[PDB]
């Protein structure tokens, strides 16, 4: 139940003569590849992004993908002619494809297609198929695409064999990055009156943040969303509703793998907060 490899594709279709396609690739929450519409070739975002594949093996994949990109555009533009509502530009196709890696040899692959921000089609087994809920008109396009056996055969090989094989390469190649421990640093601040505990710079994500009065955990601690930093570390804030006079005696406590059993305990004062 560990690392997930994601290839994220964003295709926009404005006119019947304007479109672009950009891609990002993630291994867990670290970006490994970039492929903007401008660039003829895929970019490495990490020194180890080529995985265990030889230059020639990598060339074979890049080429495989370059054919795919041009082909994808034209297929979609033609298939729009038989969509509903009739030629409904603009059109936003999103693809999410990769494989989730597990301990041992186990992995499960996926290819999900979203149309106008809604999940509509996946590749399942040997063919494309519309998911329950997906609009009626997609039936013909999927039937048409499923006639292209070459594509089916390729996609099968990619999902079943290529993905897991490549990603093992990455997980081994970028082991010292993926397993890095980055220490969180905390600070305090202030239509509900509250105190905010800022916790930034930690890696990986699993973190424990709680407002406390001594031994007692304050159950009113609201955990925020996890926000990314520019340097592949995490930012998170826990808030606590407090009225004037309830601040004294409170502290923010942070448990994180990188701290080695030594939690950050941050006490409040007159902006002069302390450890």
């Amino acid at each position: 139940k560990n690392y997930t490899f994601r290839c994220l594709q964003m295709s926009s279709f404005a006119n019947r003569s304007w479109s672009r396609t950009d891609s990002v690739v993630w291994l867990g929450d670290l970006q490994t590849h970039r492929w903007s519409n401008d660039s003829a070739t895929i970019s490495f975002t990490k020194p180890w992004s080529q995985g265990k594949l030889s230059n020639q093996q990598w060339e074979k994949l890049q080429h495989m993908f370059q054919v795919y990109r041009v082909s994808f555009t034209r297929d979609i533009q033609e298939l729009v002619k038989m969509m509903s509502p009739k030629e409904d530009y603009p059109i936003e196709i999103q693809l999410s494809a990769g494989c989730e890696m597990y301990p041992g040899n186990a992995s499960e692959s996926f290819l999900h297609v979203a149309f106008q921000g809604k999940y509509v089609v996946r590749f399942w087994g040997t063919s494309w198929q519309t998911v329950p809920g997906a609009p009626s008109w997609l039936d013909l396009p999927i039937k048409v695409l499923n006639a292209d056996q070459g594509t089916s055969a390729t996609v099968q090989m990619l999902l079943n064999d290529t993905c897991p094989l490549f990603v093992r390469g990455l997980l081994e190649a970028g082991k010292s990055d993926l397993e890095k421990q980055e220490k969180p640093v905390a600070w305090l601040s202030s239509g509900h009156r509250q105190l905010v505990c800022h916790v930034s710079g930690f890696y990986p994500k699993p973190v424990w943040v709680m407002w406390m009065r001594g031994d007692q955990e304050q159950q009113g601690t609201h955990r925020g969303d996890f926000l990314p930093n520019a340097d592949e570390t995490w930012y998170l804030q826990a808030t606590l509703d407090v009225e004037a006079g309830e601040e004294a005696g409170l502290a923010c406590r942070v448990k994180h793998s990188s701290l080695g059993g030594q939690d950050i305990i941050l006490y409040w004062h007159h902006h002069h907060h302390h450890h």
């Epitope: 054919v67 082909s71 034209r74 033609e78 048409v144 292209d148 070459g150």
Partner: antibody, heavy 120, light 108 residues
């Protein structure tokens, strides 16, 4: 059982019109569009164009614009090719073939063909 | 218009030999190529589409290959059953164009 049956051989004089038919069976007529291919005596295949069996919108290869017209009757799963003002250069066998659009236009199914002979 | 020019209009092969027919497109057609077999008196028969994918009817001695502009149809060992004309065809964009055909004949 996907099958295409065309009209019989036609013998026509220069200037006359011909109307070839092509009945499809074994698949939903509206699914695949209908393509037309010309083959003059020992000359190899030329794409005439195709017609969308759902919309009725035809597309003609440049060399066939004017004088060549695709029509169809969805009612009876039949496609038609009409050639007006027949010329000697038209004397050929015309084959209908069903395929999805143009970007999936590989022709797995062919009509038996209709030979049009042009002579005065 | 994309041109599809087949190297040879015809050549002779010794029965049993490996045959290779090359089809060259005037611009990159990214694998959207179909091969057809036609014998006098018959309709074209589709052999391979998508550069490499054989139709379920077709014997495995037939083989499709290539990329970009250059594509090849290959027969590992020609049988009498295989003397026919072979057409390549692209379906990358309109208009669809066929090659001129390569007629396979027997050496003697």
């Amino acid at each position: 059982q996907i099958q295409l049956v065309q009209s019989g051989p036609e013998l026509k004089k220069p200037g006359e019109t011909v109307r070839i038919s092509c009945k499809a069976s074994g698949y939903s007529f509206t699914n695949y569009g209908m393509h037309w291919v010309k083959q003059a005596p020992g000359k190899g295949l030329k794409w005439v164009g195709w017609i969308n069996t759902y919309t009725g919108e035809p597309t003609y290869a440049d060399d066939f614009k004017g004088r060549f017209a695709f029509s169809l009757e969805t009612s009876a799963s039949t496609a038609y090719l009409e050639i007006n003002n027949l010329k000697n250069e038209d004397m050929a066998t015309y084959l209908c073939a069903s395929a999805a659009g143009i970007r999936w236009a590989w022709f797995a199914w062919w009509g038996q063909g209709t030979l049009v002979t042009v002579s005065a | 218009d994309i041109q599809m020019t087949q190297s040879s209009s015809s050549f002779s092969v010794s029965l049993g030999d490996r045959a290779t027919i090359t089809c060259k497109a005037s611009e990159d057609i990214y694998n959207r190529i179909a091969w057809y077999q036609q014998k006098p008196g018959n309709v074209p028969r589709l052999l391979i589409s998508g550069a490499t994918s054989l139709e379920t009817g077709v014997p495995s001695r037939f083989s499709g290959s290539g990329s970009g502009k250059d594509y090849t149809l290959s027969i590992t060992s020609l049988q009498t059953e295989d003397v026919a004309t072979y057409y390549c065809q692209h379906y990358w964009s309109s208009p669809l164009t066929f090659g001129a055909g390569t007629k396979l004949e027997l050496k003697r």
